[PDB]
Amino acid sequence: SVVVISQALPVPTRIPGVADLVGFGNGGVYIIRNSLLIQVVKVINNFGYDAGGWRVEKHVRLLADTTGDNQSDVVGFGENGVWISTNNGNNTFVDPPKMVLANFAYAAGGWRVEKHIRFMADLRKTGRADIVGFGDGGIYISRNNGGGQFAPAQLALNNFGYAQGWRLDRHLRFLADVTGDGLLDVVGFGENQVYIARNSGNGTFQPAQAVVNNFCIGAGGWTISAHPRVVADLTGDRKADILGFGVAGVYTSLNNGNGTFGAVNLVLKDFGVNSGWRVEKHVRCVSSLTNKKVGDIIGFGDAGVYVALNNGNGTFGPVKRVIDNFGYNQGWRVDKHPRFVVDLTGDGCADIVGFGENSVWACMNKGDGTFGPIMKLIDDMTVSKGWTLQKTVRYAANLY
Ligand SMILES: C[Se][C@@H]1O[C@H](CO)[C@@H](O)[C@H](O)[C@H]1NC(C)=O
Ligand SMILES: C[Se][C@@H]1O[C@H](CO)[C@@H](O)[C@H](O)[C@H]1NC(C)=O
Ligand SMILES: C[Se][C@@H]1O[C@H](CO)[C@@H](O)[C@H](O)[C@H]1NC(C)=O
Ligand SMILES: C[Se][C@@H]1O[C@H](CO)[C@@H](O)[C@H](O)[C@H]1NC(C)=O
Ligand SMILES: C[Se][C@@H]1O[C@H](CO)[C@@H](O)[C@H](O)[C@H]1NC(C)=O
Ligand SMILES: [Ca+2]
Ligand SMILES: [Ca+2]
């Protein structure tokens, strides 16, 4: 499946891939390299709660390739600017980080976790991640001109910003290719319409175009607290479609192929509020689990993990419980135990990793959307080793 950057998952992972694990702990940054030797390595004495005063409430911490060598660097939007530790290539990183731009920060430009969104993305096909922010007046970009040189921020589009009424408690904003040129476009679930804005590839987006009168707070009664929405390729043409977990179950609107969108249809009477699914209890994801390389549905429910496989065209097979674990009944909690659907093995069929109370656990896809046994990875990066959602940030990420 394709590169989509979302609020929930701001660090995309590759399909196929062998993702690593990265934790911003109280003491700094730690990695678990996906390899024959599984261990935790501390790489940076910074970007932590007690290593630089980093706070989930004020600061943003991401991974992105900022040089074009396909190795992920550590990027932090700190108190007064953007800080970067680059990947040295050998399971080490530059420490300390350097400040590349005095903007996109709590005390540089007045950026706020409660009002604004900050991502890193290669928006101009340079091979390097630019800084992209949904701020007050619209979307701002700072161009990554290479050699650690980031240009002053410029307005990319006067839309999708706080000034245009966009709110984190009502609306959703994504970056995803909806046209097929490989450039990430804006997809925004607004007050009463889904909008797209076409990336021109030059640090600007085209005027926003309304494409769907649904999936929004004021179009079908879609709420942030009950009804998660995602953007993903459901058909295999590498153009993103829309999928929402609504009241009756799963609704889609399929891309016509040019970034306009078709009718909204209920495609599966499961994974929705009426089947007992709750944002506070459960995790719902779309990722490629099969050799069809299309979005399949995965839900971490009460009794375990449930999967519905896409036939290749956006229609879905029966729901099956594939793993009797990682579920609310087994003690897993949204507010304690991060769970990700990510390729860990390199076959293109996403696997499961969960940061449990005591250990990190994985479960491998057999290659067909069914799963083997649960595997212990390590006894670290967990609640009992001092990791909480309030004070730490954890990701699956392809470091290399
Ligand atoms: C006075 Se901000 C503080 O600066 C030091 C370097 O002086 C840096 O090590 C920290 O990471 C940074 N923390 C944040 C949150 O920005
Ligand atoms: C790239 Se900072 C951005 O700068 C413009 C002018 O440059 C200012 O009006 C914005 O309010 C400020 N902050 C945010 C959060 O959008
Ligand atoms: C009256 Se809603 C408002 O409409 C205008 C015009 O279409 C659009 O440019 C804004 O982005 C949209 N804002 C949200 C939050 O939906
Ligand atoms: C009163 Se539910 C509402 O039903 C209509 C069709 O009746 C559908 O278009 C909406 O998308 C759906 N909203 C959610 C959140 O499920
Ligand atoms: C009483 Se849990 C329930 O089990 C059925 C199958 O028995 C499954 O199809 C549902 O989607 C699942 N819901 C949740 C929240 O896990
Ligand atoms: Ca595009
Ligand atoms: Ca796999």
Side-chain angles (χ1 to χ4, degrees):
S1 69
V2 294
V3 181
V4 175
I5 300 170
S6 73
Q7 288 167 226
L9 297 166
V11 180
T13 54
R14 304 158 181 187
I15 287 274
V18 288
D20 311 297
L21 306 181
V22 183
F24 297 85
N26 294 352
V29 186
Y30 304 80
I31 69 173
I32 299 159
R33 179 77 183 269
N34 187 324
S35 76
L36 301 175
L37 177 61
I38 308 301
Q39 66 188 356
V40 175
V41 175
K42 192 179 185 191
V43 294
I44 307 159
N45 189 220
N46 217 309
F47 302 106
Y49 190 91
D50 297 311
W54 289 70
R55 297 290 184 271
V56 305
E57 299 90 353
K58 299 183 72 184
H59 310 123
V60 174
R61 281 163 288 174
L62 303 170
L63 298 134
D65 172 11
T66 76
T67 78
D69 76 355
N70 304 121
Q71 303 175 8
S72 296
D73 308 313
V74 170
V75 180
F77 301 78
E79 192 74 359
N80 341 100
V82 184
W83 295 87
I84 301 178
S85 280
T86 57
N87 198 323
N88 285 323
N90 63 344
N91 296 333
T92 72
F93 288 73
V94 177
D95 186 9
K98 66 206 270 170
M99 190 194 277
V100 300
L101 193 71
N103 209 333
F104 299 100
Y106 193 91
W111 286 73
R112 292 290 180 278
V113 173
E114 41 280 288
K115 296 178 62 169
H116 306 125
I117 298 163
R118 283 160 288 180
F119 296 151
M120 298 295 295
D122 177 2
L123 298 177
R124 301 170 295 119
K125 279 173 181 183
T126 60
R128 295 189 300 282
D130 300 314
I131 300 162
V132 42
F134 296 78
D136 250 84
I139 305 170
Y140 303 87
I141 291 172
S142 166
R143 285 188 172 203
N144 185 336
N145 285 326
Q149 302 305 298
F150 285 76
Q154 296 290 331
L155 189 75
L157 180 64
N158 65 327
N159 217 325
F160 303 100
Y162 202 84
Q164 300 86 36
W166 292 78
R167 302 287 187 277
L168 291 171
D169 65 344
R170 288 174 94 73
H171 310 127
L172 293 163
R173 285 156 284 176
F174 297 81
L175 299 173
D177 182 15
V178 299
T179 69
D181 65 359
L183 290 170
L184 299 178
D185 308 303
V186 182
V187 185
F189 293 69
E191 195 75 351
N192 82 330
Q193 303 180 116
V194 185
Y195 297 85
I196 68 127
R198 295 163 198 256
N199 188 341
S200 292
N202 62 10
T204 72
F205 303 90
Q206 306 184 14
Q209 305 166 275
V211 293
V212 184
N213 183 226
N214 215 313
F215 299 107
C216 297
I217 192 170
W222 292 75
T223 73
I224 294 304
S225 58
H227 317 118
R229 283 135 284 163
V230 301
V231 166
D233 176 19
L234 300 182
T235 72
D237 65 359
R238 312 198 57 74
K239 306 170 192 179
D241 306 295
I242 297 164
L243 188 146
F245 300 95
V247 177
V250 181
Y251 292 82
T252 64
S253 169
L254 299 179
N255 195 319
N256 290 322
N258 63 354
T260 67
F261 285 80
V264 179
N265 294 297
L266 180 61
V267 298
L268 184 68
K269 286 190 197 202
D270 210 327
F271 299 106
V273 173
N274 281 3
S275 294
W277 295 77
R278 303 284 184 277
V279 171
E280 333 72 81
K281 289 182 88 180
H282 303 127
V283 182
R284 283 161 287 181
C285 308
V286 171
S287 191
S288 179
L289 305 180
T290 74
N291 69 10
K292 302 182 180 294
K293 220 171 168 189
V294 292
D296 304 300
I297 300 165
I298 312 94
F300 298 80
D302 291 326
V305 181
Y306 292 91
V307 164
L309 302 172
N310 185 332
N311 299 311
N313 67 353
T315 66
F316 292 92
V319 183
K320 297 171 177 52
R321 192 170 81 257
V322 294
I323 309 168
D324 295 348
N325 219 307
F326 301 106
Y328 190 91
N329 289 349
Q330 292 91 31
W332 291 72
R333 299 287 178 272
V334 171
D335 64 347
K336 302 187 177 165
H337 307 126
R339 285 161 282 172
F340 300 105
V341 173
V342 52
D343 199 9
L344 298 174
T345 70
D347 69 336
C349 296
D351 311 297
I352 295 165
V353 60
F355 293 84
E357 187 79 7
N358 290 281
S359 306
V360 181
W361 301 92
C363 189
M364 306 312 188
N365 196 315
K366 295 174 160 192
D368 60 3
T370 68
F371 287 80
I374 304 263
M375 289 168 50
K376 186 180 289 192
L377 292 192
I378 197 147
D379 295 349
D380 207 342
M381 290 199 189
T382 51
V383 172
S384 74
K385 292 278 176 136
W387 291 71
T388 68
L389 260 68
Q390 310 88 271
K391 293 211 304 182
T392 69
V393 181
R394 285 161 288 176
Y395 294 110
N398 305 95
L399 295 177
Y400 312 89

